[PDB]
Design a protein around this ligand. Structure first.
Ligand SMILES: C[C@H](NC(=O)Cc1cc(F)cc(F)c1)C(=O)N[C@H]1CC=C[C@H](c2ccccc2)N(C)C1=O
Ligand SMILES: [Mn+2]
Length: 261
């Protein structure tokens, strides 16, 4: 039940994906000690609406109250911007951005470290990005999606870290979240053979301590159960005849947009 995208659809996703990447490029010099997450969010929302002529897919999405997700330290995902929440030296911060343009979605996220890195922070974020690039390099027609989760998990566990189970990447298009579910670990539950024209995200969430998570009073916010740090990165891709094209590359990404086999 995955439907593929036409060349006209894929080009609309290049546009939306580039816009999402550019938000993350735009926000970087604002991410420093003492800025609030609430300020960061309004800066991004203004940019999307009034500079990019587009709209945040997050804003109002099934109740989600802000325009981007901002998760710090032990928060794994869905962290909600708050004018009371000030960044501090050593914090690790994810910002996930999803833009809709001309009816198509582009979703991406990265980590930013505030001030001077802690040793554990620097290593966690690096391992997490490397786990994603390892997965991107596997994508091509005829492989099973299950291989990708298995590879991510093996790599991450060899570094003495854990892979979050309950949240995952996803198909993406005219909708924010479509088939398939993209697990970051090995599971019987995955059985999907990639074909050209499929679009989806990969977005591993890696914990420093154990894998288990808990859900907060606000509903949305997910933290680590052992209160260790957690990190994530994401890109949106399209499967090509011989590999993949990454649709959300930033200038600070260290991999080409096309991967060929
Ligand atoms: C971590 C990722 N993050 C995002 O997609 C970014 C995001 C930003 C935002 F502002 C509002 C959002 F709901 C989601 C994710 O939520 N993935 C989803 C994929 C599909 C379905 C569900 C699901 C669960 C709870 C809420 C929504 C979907 N599961 C289990 C997931 O793991
Ligand atoms: Mn996503």
């Amino acid at each position: 039940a995955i439907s593929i995208k036409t060349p006209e659809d894929i080009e609309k996703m290049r546009v939306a994906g580039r816009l999402a990447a550019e938000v993350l490029e735009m926000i970087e010099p604002y991410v420093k000690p003492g800025v609030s997450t609430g300020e960061l969010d309004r800066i991004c929302n203004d940019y999307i609406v009034n500079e990019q002529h587009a709209v945040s897919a997050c804003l109002g999405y099934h109740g989600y109250p802000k325009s981007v997700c901002i998760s710090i330290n032990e928060v794994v995902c869905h962290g909600i911007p708050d004018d009371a929440k000030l960044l501090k030296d050593g914090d690790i911060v994810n910002i996930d951005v999803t833009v809709i343009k001309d009816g198509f979605h582009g979703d991406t996220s990265k980590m930013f470290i505030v001030g001077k890195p802690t040793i554990m922070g620097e290593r966690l974020c690096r391992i997490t990005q490397e786990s994603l690039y390892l997965a991107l390099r596997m994508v091509k027609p005829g492989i099973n999606l299950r291989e990708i989760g298995a590879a991510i998990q093996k790599f991450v566990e060899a570094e003495g870290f854990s892979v979050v189970r309950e949240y995952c990447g996803h198909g993406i298009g005219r909708g924010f979240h479509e088939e398939p579910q993209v697990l970051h670990y090995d599971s019987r539950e995955t059985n999907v053979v990639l074909k050209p024209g499929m679009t989806f995200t990969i977005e591993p969430m890696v914990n420093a301590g154990k894998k288990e998570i808990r859900t907060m009073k606000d509903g949305w916010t997910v933290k680590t159960k052992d209160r260790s740090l957690s990190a994530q990165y994401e890109h949106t891709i399209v499967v090509t005849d011989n590999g993949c094209e990454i649709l959300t590359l930033r200038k600070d990404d260290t991999i080409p947009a096309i991967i060929s086999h």
